[PDB]
Symmetry: D2
Subunit: 115 residues, 4 copies
Protein backbone atom coordinates (compact mmCIF):
# COMPACT_ATOMS: atom_id res chain seq x y z
CA UNK A 1 0.00 0.00 0.00
CA UNK A 2 1.94 3.03 -1.22
CA UNK A 3 -0.46 5.84 -0.19
CA UNK A 4 -2.50 6.20 3.04
CA UNK A 5 -4.14 9.17 4.80
CA UNK A 6 -4.70 9.34 8.55
CA UNK A 7 -6.90 12.08 9.94
CA UNK A 8 -7.24 13.08 13.58
CA UNK A 9 -9.62 15.44 15.37
CA UNK A 10 -7.37 17.40 17.77
CA UNK A 11 -10.33 19.25 19.25
CA UNK A 12 -12.43 16.24 20.35
CA UNK A 13 -9.37 14.05 20.79
CA UNK A 14 -10.45 11.32 18.39
CA UNK A 15 -10.09 9.87 14.91
CA UNK A 16 -11.81 11.94 12.21
CA UNK A 17 -14.26 9.36 10.91
CA UNK A 18 -16.04 9.25 7.52
CA UNK A 19 -14.03 12.15 6.10
CA UNK A 20 -13.93 12.45 2.31
CA UNK A 21 -10.50 12.40 0.68
CA UNK A 22 -9.75 13.06 -3.02
CA UNK A 23 -6.43 12.48 -4.73
CA UNK A 24 -5.30 13.99 -8.03
CA UNK A 25 -2.16 13.75 -10.17
CA UNK A 26 -0.81 16.49 -12.45
CA UNK A 27 -0.96 15.50 -16.12
CA UNK A 28 1.71 16.40 -18.70
CA UNK A 29 -0.08 19.67 -19.46
CA UNK A 30 -0.89 21.44 -16.19
CA UNK A 31 -4.23 19.98 -15.15
CA UNK A 32 -5.16 17.98 -12.07
CA UNK A 33 -6.68 14.70 -13.17
CA UNK A 34 -8.64 12.52 -10.70
CA UNK A 35 -6.45 9.76 -9.27
CA UNK A 36 -8.40 8.19 -6.39
CA UNK A 37 -10.78 8.94 -3.54
CA UNK A 38 -12.31 7.46 -0.41
CA UNK A 39 -13.53 8.11 3.12
CA UNK A 40 -11.73 7.58 6.42
CA UNK A 41 -12.79 4.62 8.57
CA UNK A 42 -13.57 4.37 12.29
CA UNK A 43 -9.85 4.64 13.05
CA UNK A 44 -9.62 7.79 10.94
CA UNK A 45 -7.56 5.95 8.35
CA UNK A 46 -7.94 5.45 4.62
CA UNK A 47 -6.09 2.53 2.99
CA UNK A 48 -6.10 0.99 -0.50
CA UNK A 49 -6.35 4.23 -2.46
CA UNK A 50 -3.94 2.91 -5.06
CA UNK A 51 -1.32 0.32 -5.98
CA UNK A 52 2.44 0.32 -6.59
CA UNK A 53 1.77 -0.23 -10.31
CA UNK A 54 -0.53 2.78 -10.64
CA UNK A 55 1.27 5.11 -8.19
CA UNK A 56 4.05 6.26 -10.54
CA UNK A 57 6.28 9.30 -10.11
CA UNK A 58 4.40 12.56 -10.29
CA UNK A 59 3.05 15.59 -8.48
CA UNK A 60 0.05 14.58 -6.38
CA UNK A 61 -2.66 16.52 -4.63
CA UNK A 62 -4.53 15.18 -1.60
CA UNK A 63 -7.59 17.20 -0.59
CA UNK A 64 -9.34 16.40 2.69
CA UNK A 65 -12.94 17.58 3.03
CA UNK A 66 -12.58 18.98 6.52
CA UNK A 67 -15.47 21.38 6.02
CA UNK A 68 -18.12 18.66 5.79
CA UNK A 69 -16.55 16.98 8.84
CA UNK A 70 -16.97 20.05 11.04
CA UNK A 71 -20.40 20.98 9.64
CA UNK A 72 -21.67 17.51 10.54
CA UNK A 73 -20.74 18.30 14.14
CA UNK A 74 -22.56 21.66 13.85
CA UNK A 75 -19.37 23.73 13.45
CA UNK A 76 -18.83 26.20 10.63
CA UNK A 77 -15.00 25.96 10.44
CA UNK A 78 -12.49 28.42 9.07
CA UNK A 79 -11.20 26.25 6.22
CA UNK A 80 -12.93 24.83 3.19
CA UNK A 81 -10.52 21.87 3.27
CA UNK A 82 -7.00 20.66 4.10
CA UNK A 83 -4.81 20.11 1.06
CA UNK A 84 -1.28 18.83 0.42
CA UNK A 85 0.55 18.91 -2.92
CA UNK A 86 3.78 16.93 -3.16
CA UNK A 87 6.11 15.13 -5.52
CA UNK A 88 6.03 11.37 -5.07
CA UNK A 89 8.56 8.65 -5.93
CA UNK A 90 11.12 11.03 -7.40
CA UNK A 91 14.00 8.93 -6.01
CA UNK A 92 12.26 5.60 -6.36
CA UNK A 93 8.97 4.22 -5.02
CA UNK A 94 8.18 5.05 -1.39
CA UNK A 95 5.24 4.49 0.92
CA UNK A 96 3.42 7.71 1.79
CA UNK A 97 1.20 8.53 4.74
CA UNK A 98 -0.44 11.93 4.79
CA UNK A 99 -1.04 12.64 8.47
CA UNK A 100 -3.52 15.43 9.10
CA UNK A 101 -4.42 16.93 12.51
CA UNK A 102 -7.62 19.03 12.56
CA UNK A 103 -9.19 21.88 14.57
CA UNK A 104 -11.90 24.33 13.45
CA UNK A 105 -9.37 27.15 13.13
CA UNK A 106 -6.19 25.30 12.25
CA UNK A 107 -4.66 22.12 10.88
CA UNK A 108 -1.43 20.50 9.96
CA UNK A 109 -0.70 18.07 7.15
CA UNK A 110 2.60 16.27 6.94
CA UNK A 111 3.93 13.73 4.48
CA UNK A 112 5.52 10.69 6.16
CA UNK A 113 7.75 8.86 3.67
CA UNK A 114 9.18 5.36 4.24
CA UNK A 115 10.97 2.72 2.12
Amino acid sequence: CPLMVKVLDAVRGSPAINVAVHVFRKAADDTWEPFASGKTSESGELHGLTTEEEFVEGIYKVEIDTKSYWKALGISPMHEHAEVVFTANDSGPRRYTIAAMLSPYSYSTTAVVTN
Copy 2:
Protein backbone atom coordinates in the same frame (compact mmCIF):
# COMPACT_ATOMS: atom_id res chain seq x y z
CA CYS B 1 -5.88 46.01 8.16
CA PRO B 2 -8.47 43.22 7.92
CA LEU B 3 -6.10 40.58 6.51
CA MET B 4 -2.54 39.74 7.51
CA VAL B 5 -0.50 36.71 6.48
CA LYS B 6 2.47 35.43 8.46
CA VAL B 7 4.86 32.69 7.38
CA LEU B 8 7.24 30.90 9.73
CA ASP B 9 10.17 28.54 9.16
CA ALA B 10 9.83 25.35 11.23
CA VAL B 11 13.38 24.17 10.53
CA ARG B 12 15.36 27.31 11.32
CA GLY B 13 12.91 28.76 13.82
CA SER B 14 12.76 32.15 12.15
CA PRO B 15 10.36 34.26 10.16
CA ALA B 16 10.22 33.13 6.52
CA ILE B 17 11.35 36.37 4.84
CA ASN B 18 10.62 37.59 1.30
CA VAL B 19 8.03 34.86 0.68
CA ALA B 20 5.54 35.28 -2.19
CA VAL B 21 1.90 35.07 -1.23
CA HIS B 22 -1.05 35.25 -3.62
CA VAL B 23 -4.66 35.69 -2.56
CA PHE B 24 -7.69 34.85 -4.71
CA ARG B 25 -11.45 35.21 -4.15
CA LYS B 26 -13.95 32.75 -5.61
CA ALA B 27 -16.37 34.39 -8.06
CA ALA B 28 -20.07 33.67 -8.38
CA ASP B 29 -19.23 31.45 -11.36
CA ASP B 30 -16.92 29.29 -9.24
CA THR B 31 -13.66 30.67 -10.69
CA TRP B 32 -10.70 32.05 -8.74
CA GLU B 33 -10.40 35.79 -9.19
CA PRO B 34 -7.02 37.37 -8.34
CA PHE B 35 -7.44 39.41 -5.14
CA ALA B 36 -4.03 40.65 -3.92
CA SER B 37 -0.43 39.49 -3.55
CA GLY B 38 2.84 40.44 -1.92
CA LYS B 39 5.96 39.26 -0.13
CA THR B 40 6.56 38.74 3.59
CA SER B 41 8.80 41.31 5.30
CA GLU B 42 11.76 40.71 7.62
CA SER B 43 9.32 39.85 10.42
CA GLY B 44 7.76 37.15 8.24
CA GLU B 45 4.59 39.19 7.89
CA LEU B 46 2.62 40.57 4.98
CA HIS B 47 0.51 43.63 5.82
CA GLY B 48 -1.57 45.93 3.61
CA LEU B 49 -2.93 43.27 1.25
CA THR B 50 -6.39 44.77 1.34
CA THR B 51 -8.93 47.18 2.85
CA GLU B 52 -12.09 46.87 4.95
CA GLU B 53 -14.13 48.10 1.94
CA GLU B 54 -12.46 45.65 -0.38
CA PHE B 55 -12.39 42.60 1.86
CA VAL B 56 -16.02 41.54 1.47
CA GLU B 57 -17.64 38.26 2.43
CA GLY B 58 -16.41 35.33 0.41
CA ILE B 59 -14.25 32.26 -0.01
CA TYR B 60 -10.56 33.13 -0.24
CA LYS B 61 -7.48 31.14 -1.22
CA VAL B 62 -3.98 32.04 0.02
CA GLU B 63 -1.21 30.36 -1.98
CA ILE B 64 2.34 30.48 -0.62
CA ASP B 65 5.38 29.94 -2.85
CA THR B 66 7.09 27.79 -0.19
CA LYS B 67 9.16 26.08 -2.83
CA SER B 68 11.11 29.17 -3.88
CA TYR B 69 11.67 29.87 -0.17
CA TRP B 70 13.35 26.51 0.44
CA LYS B 71 15.29 26.68 -2.84
CA ALA B 72 16.95 29.90 -1.70
CA LEU B 73 17.98 28.14 1.52
CA GLY B 74 19.70 25.32 -0.34
CA ILE B 75 16.83 22.90 0.27
CA SER B 76 14.85 20.85 -2.26
CA PRO B 77 11.44 20.26 -0.57
CA MET B 78 8.89 17.53 -0.99
CA HIS B 79 5.87 19.85 -0.61
CA GLU B 80 5.20 21.88 -3.78
CA HIS B 81 3.64 24.87 -2.02
CA ALA B 82 1.09 25.64 0.68
CA GLU B 83 -2.53 26.62 0.10
CA VAL B 84 -5.11 27.72 2.63
CA VAL B 85 -8.73 28.16 1.57
CA PHE B 86 -11.16 29.81 3.99
CA THR B 87 -14.54 31.57 4.27
CA ALA B 88 -14.24 35.15 5.45
CA ASN B 89 -16.62 37.70 6.98
CA ASP B 90 -19.70 35.48 6.62
CA SER B 91 -20.92 36.81 9.97
CA GLY B 92 -19.83 40.40 9.65
CA PRO B 93 -16.41 42.05 9.16
CA ARG B 94 -13.55 40.45 11.09
CA ARG B 95 -9.80 40.95 11.20
CA TYR B 96 -7.91 37.83 10.11
CA THR B 97 -4.34 36.72 10.76
CA ILE B 98 -3.54 33.65 8.62
CA ALA B 99 -0.31 32.01 9.72
CA ALA B 100 1.53 29.17 7.97
CA MET B 101 4.46 27.27 9.51
CA LEU B 102 6.71 25.49 7.00
CA SER B 103 8.90 22.43 6.76
CA PRO B 104 10.09 20.62 3.65
CA TYR B 105 7.58 17.76 4.37
CA SER B 106 4.83 19.58 6.15
CA TYR B 107 2.91 22.73 6.91
CA SER B 108 0.57 23.78 9.66
CA THR B 109 -1.77 26.76 9.42
CA THR B 110 -3.72 28.83 11.92
CA ALA B 111 -6.36 31.54 11.72
CA VAL B 112 -6.89 34.11 14.45
CA VAL B 113 -10.15 35.99 14.01
CA THR B 114 -11.05 39.17 15.94
Copy 3:
Protein backbone atom coordinates in the same frame (compact mmCIF):
# COMPACT_ATOMS: atom_id res chain seq x y z
CA CYS C 1 11.44 42.51 24.81
CA PRO C 2 13.54 39.31 24.73
CA LEU C 3 10.68 36.94 25.64
CA MET C 4 7.04 37.13 24.55
CA VAL C 5 4.38 34.45 25.03
CA LYS C 6 1.19 34.25 22.93
CA VAL C 7 -1.73 31.92 23.59
CA LEU C 8 -4.48 31.10 21.10
CA ASP C 9 -7.75 29.11 21.17
CA ALA C 10 -7.98 26.57 18.28
CA VAL C 11 -11.63 25.85 19.07
CA ARG C 12 -12.90 29.44 18.73
CA GLY C 13 -10.13 30.88 16.57
CA SER C 14 -9.38 33.74 18.93
CA PRO C 15 -6.66 35.00 21.27
CA ALA C 16 -6.87 33.27 24.67
CA ILE C 17 -7.35 36.15 27.11
CA ASN C 18 -6.37 36.34 30.77
CA VAL C 19 -4.38 33.10 30.54
CA ALA C 20 -1.92 32.69 33.40
CA VAL C 21 1.72 32.09 32.44
CA HIS C 22 4.60 31.15 34.76
CA VAL C 23 8.22 31.07 33.68
CA PHE C 24 10.91 29.14 35.57
CA ARG C 25 14.66 28.73 35.01
CA LYS C 26 16.50 25.54 35.94
CA ALA C 27 19.04 26.19 38.72
CA ALA C 28 22.53 24.69 39.07
CA ASP C 29 21.13 22.09 41.47
CA ASP C 30 18.40 20.99 39.03
CA THR C 31 15.44 22.73 40.63
CA TRP C 32 13.02 25.07 38.87
CA GLU C 33 13.74 28.63 39.99
CA PRO C 34 10.71 30.95 39.62
CA PHE C 35 11.67 33.42 36.88
CA ALA C 36 8.64 35.52 35.88
CA SER C 37 4.84 35.39 35.47
CA GLY C 38 1.84 37.25 34.09
CA LYS C 39 -1.44 36.98 32.18
CA THR C 40 -2.22 37.24 28.48
CA SER C 41 -3.91 40.48 27.38
CA GLU C 42 -6.87 40.92 25.02
CA SER C 43 -4.56 40.15 22.10
CA GLY C 44 -3.63 36.87 23.75
CA GLU C 45 -0.08 38.15 24.15
CA LEU C 46 2.05 38.62 27.24
CA HIS C 47 4.81 41.20 27.03
CA GLY C 48 7.32 42.46 29.57
CA LEU C 49 7.93 39.16 31.32
CA THR C 50 11.68 39.86 31.56
CA THR C 51 14.54 42.13 30.44
CA GLU C 52 17.80 41.71 28.51
CA GLU C 53 19.74 41.93 31.81
CA GLU C 54 17.79 39.21 33.61
CA PHE C 55 17.30 36.84 30.65
CA VAL C 56 20.59 34.96 30.74
CA GLU C 57 21.53 31.67 29.12
CA GLY C 58 19.76 28.61 30.53
CA ILE C 59 16.93 26.10 30.35
CA TYR C 60 13.57 27.76 30.79
CA LYS C 61 10.11 26.34 31.40
CA VAL C 62 6.95 28.22 30.37
CA GLU C 63 3.94 26.78 32.21
CA ILE C 64 0.56 27.74 30.76
CA ASP C 65 -2.52 27.41 33.00
CA THR C 66 -4.73 26.09 30.22
CA LYS C 67 -7.07 24.44 32.70
CA SER C 68 -8.34 27.67 34.29
CA TYR C 69 -8.82 29.12 30.82
CA TRP C 70 -11.16 26.35 29.68
CA LYS C 71 -13.04 26.28 33.00
CA ALA C 72 -13.95 29.95 32.62
CA LEU C 73 -15.40 28.98 29.25
CA GLY C 74 -17.60 26.27 30.79
CA ILE C 75 -15.27 23.48 29.61
CA SER C 76 -13.65 20.75 31.73
CA PRO C 77 -10.52 19.84 29.64
CA MET C 78 -8.52 16.65 29.65
CA HIS C 79 -5.24 18.62 29.14
CA GLU C 80 -4.15 19.91 32.55
CA HIS C 81 -1.64 22.56 31.48
CA ALA C 82 1.10 23.09 28.95
CA GLU C 83 4.82 23.10 29.72
CA VAL C 84 7.18 24.48 27.07
CA VAL C 85 10.82 23.81 28.03
CA PHE C 86 13.67 25.20 25.97
CA THR C 87 17.28 26.31 26.14
CA ALA C 88 17.66 30.03 25.62
CA ASN C 89 20.57 32.27 24.62
CA ASP C 90 23.17 29.48 24.51
CA SER C 91 24.84 31.11 21.52
CA GLY C 92 24.24 34.68 22.63
CA PRO C 93 21.12 36.77 23.45
CA ARG C 94 18.14 36.24 21.14
CA ARG C 95 14.55 37.40 21.12
CA TYR C 96 11.97 34.64 21.62
CA THR C 97 8.26 34.50 20.81
CA ILE C 98 6.67 31.39 22.33
CA ALA C 99 3.18 30.72 20.94
CA ALA C 100 0.80 27.97 22.15
CA MET C 101 -2.43 26.95 20.34
CA LEU C 102 -4.99 25.20 22.56
CA SER C 103 -7.86 22.70 22.47
CA PRO C 104 -9.28 20.63 25.37
CA TYR C 105 -7.33 17.57 24.11
CA SER C 106 -4.31 19.06 22.44
CA TYR C 107 -1.82 21.88 22.10
CA SER C 108 0.74 22.84 19.53
CA THR C 109 3.59 25.26 20.24
CA THR C 110 6.01 27.22 18.07
CA ALA C 111 9.09 29.35 18.83
CA VAL C 112 10.27 32.18 16.62
CA VAL C 113 13.85 33.18 17.39
CA THR C 114 15.52 36.35 16.08
Copy 4:
Protein backbone atom coordinates in the same frame (compact mmCIF):
# COMPACT_ATOMS: atom_id res chain seq x y z
CA CYS D 1 -3.08 -1.62 25.77
CA PRO D 2 -4.51 1.61 27.29
CA LEU D 3 -1.64 4.01 26.52
CA MET D 4 0.32 4.26 23.27
CA VAL D 5 2.48 7.10 21.97
CA LYS D 6 3.20 7.70 18.29
CA VAL D 7 5.87 10.20 17.25
CA LEU D 8 6.39 11.69 13.78
CA ASP D 9 9.25 13.80 12.43
CA ALA D 10 7.42 16.42 10.37
CA VAL D 11 10.71 17.94 9.26
CA ARG D 12 12.26 14.89 7.60
CA GLY D 13 8.90 13.29 6.92
CA SER D 14 9.42 10.07 8.82
CA PRO D 15 8.59 8.19 11.99
CA ALA D 16 10.77 9.40 14.87
CA ILE D 17 12.69 6.22 15.61
CA ASN D 18 14.34 5.23 18.89
CA VAL D 19 13.03 8.22 20.80
CA ALA D 20 12.94 7.88 24.60
CA VAL D 21 9.58 8.39 26.27
CA HIS D 22 9.01 8.79 30.01
CA VAL D 23 5.58 8.66 31.65
CA PHE D 24 4.87 9.96 35.17
CA ARG D 25 1.80 10.06 37.46
CA LYS D 26 1.15 12.80 39.99
CA ALA D 27 1.02 11.15 43.42
CA ALA D 28 -1.36 11.88 46.32
CA ASP D 29 1.15 14.55 47.37
CA ASP D 30 1.90 16.87 44.47
CA THR D 31 4.89 15.15 42.94
CA TRP D 32 5.61 13.38 39.64
CA GLU D 33 6.46 9.75 40.36
CA PRO D 34 7.91 7.48 37.65
CA PHE D 35 5.19 5.44 36.00
CA ALA D 36 6.64 3.94 32.81
CA SER D 37 9.13 4.45 29.98
CA GLY D 38 10.31 3.11 26.63
CA LYS D 39 11.68 3.94 23.19
CA THR D 40 9.82 4.31 19.93
CA SER D 41 10.24 1.59 17.30
CA GLU D 42 11.07 1.85 13.59
CA SER D 43 7.43 2.86 13.06
CA GLY D 44 7.78 5.63 15.64
CA GLU D 45 5.30 3.94 17.96
CA LEU D 46 5.67 2.74 21.57
CA HIS D 47 3.35 0.00 22.84
CA GLY D 48 3.15 -1.96 26.07
CA LEU D 49 3.93 0.93 28.43
CA THR D 50 1.36 -0.25 30.92
CA THR D 51 -1.68 -2.46 31.46
CA GLU D 52 -5.38 -1.94 32.08
CA GLU D 53 -4.83 -2.98 35.71
CA GLU D 54 -1.96 -0.54 36.35
CA PHE D 55 -3.32 2.46 34.39
CA VAL D 56 -5.67 3.93 37.03
CA GLU D 57 -7.22 7.39 37.31
CA GLY D 58 -4.72 10.16 37.83
CA ILE D 59 -2.89 13.03 36.22
CA TYR D 60 -0.15 11.78 33.93
CA LYS D 61 2.71 13.46 32.18
CA VAL D 62 4.20 12.02 29.00
CA GLU D 63 7.64 13.44 28.21
CA ILE D 64 9.29 12.74 24.85
CA ASP D 65 13.03 13.36 24.63
CA THR D 66 13.02 15.27 21.35
CA LYS D 67 16.33 16.96 22.20
CA SER D 68 18.31 13.72 21.94
CA TYR D 69 16.43 12.91 18.75
CA TRP D 70 17.40 16.12 16.92
CA LYS D 71 21.02 15.97 18.15
CA ALA D 72 21.47 12.43 16.83
CA LEU D 73 20.37 13.75 13.43
CA GLY D 74 22.68 16.73 13.72
CA ILE D 75 19.87 19.28 13.95
CA SER D 76 19.92 21.90 16.69
CA PRO D 77 16.64 21.84 18.65
CA MET D 78 14.76 24.61 20.43
CA HIS D 79 12.99 22.49 23.04
CA GLU D 80 14.24 20.10 25.68
CA HIS D 81 11.25 17.83 24.99
CA ALA D 82 7.65 17.51 23.73
CA GLU D 83 5.25 16.91 26.59
CA VAL D 84 1.60 16.34 27.51
CA VAL D 85 -0.01 16.35 30.96
CA PHE D 86 -3.57 15.06 31.12
CA THR D 87 -6.09 13.47 33.45
CA ALA D 88 -6.79 9.88 32.44
CA ASN D 89 -9.67 7.52 33.14
CA ASP D 90 -11.54 10.14 35.17
CA SER D 91 -14.86 8.97 33.71
CA GLY D 92 -13.96 5.30 33.44
CA PRO D 93 -11.15 3.47 31.54
CA ARG D 94 -10.19 4.78 28.10
CA ARG D 95 -7.54 3.99 25.49
CA TYR D 96 -5.06 6.81 25.07
CA THR D 97 -2.90 7.47 22.04
CA ILE D 98 -0.55 10.43 22.33
CA ALA D 99 0.11 11.68 18.81
CA ALA D 100 3.11 14.01 18.69
CA MET D 101 4.29 15.80 15.56
CA LEU D 102 7.84 17.20 15.79
CA SER D 103 9.93 19.96 14.25
CA PRO D 104 13.08 21.60 15.61
CA TYR D 105 11.22 24.76 16.62
CA SER D 106 7.76 23.38 17.25
CA TYR D 107 5.64 20.42 18.29
CA SER D 108 2.06 19.41 18.78
CA THR D 109 0.84 16.68 21.12
CA THR D 110 -2.76 15.52 21.13
CA ALA D 111 -4.46 12.91 23.23
CA VAL D 112 -6.62 10.65 21.05
CA VAL D 113 -9.13 9.09 23.44
CA THR D 114 -11.23 6.02 22.53
CA ASN D 115 -13.42 3.41 24.30
